[PDB]
């Protein structure tokens, strides 16, 4: 999981790596995402690929 | 960084967070990204130097 954000020019890049006993879809679990890195780029972004 | 003194009322400033009080070592545990603690009433209660 790679939650992203862009507030106050603080382009945060979260992450979380959790293995589960499922190979079909997202499970009925719950895992918080720690701010692995933070990128103070302060640019305007509106699209990605 | 000049000094660190404990158990006596001083003016502590950690990276920008300012405040007056006594610094007491505790057995609490943080997370690597987490910096300073907090109470149930928006009260600062711990700061990892």
């Amino acid at each position: 999981e790679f939650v992203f954000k862009n507030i106050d020019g603080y382009f945060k890049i979260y992450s979380k790596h959790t293995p589960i006993n499922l190979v079909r879809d997202l499970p009925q679990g719950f895992s918080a995402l720690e701010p692995l890195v933070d990128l103070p780029i302060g640019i305007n972004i509106t699209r990605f690929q | 960084s000049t000094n660190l003194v404990k158990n006596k009322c001083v003016n502590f400033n950690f990276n920008g967070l300012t405040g007056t009080g006594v610094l007491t070592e505790s057995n609490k545990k943080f997370l690597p990204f987490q910096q300073f603690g907090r109470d149930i009433a928006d009260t600062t209660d711990a700061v990892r130097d």
Binding site: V3, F30, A32 | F33
Partner: peptide, 17 residues
């Protein structure tokens, strides 16, 4: 094509402990 992200996207809003 679509699925249910049940309780996903709950991170730490701050480095405050």
């Amino acid at each position: 094509a679509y699925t249910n992200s049940f309780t996903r996207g709950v991170y730490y809003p701050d480095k405050v402990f």
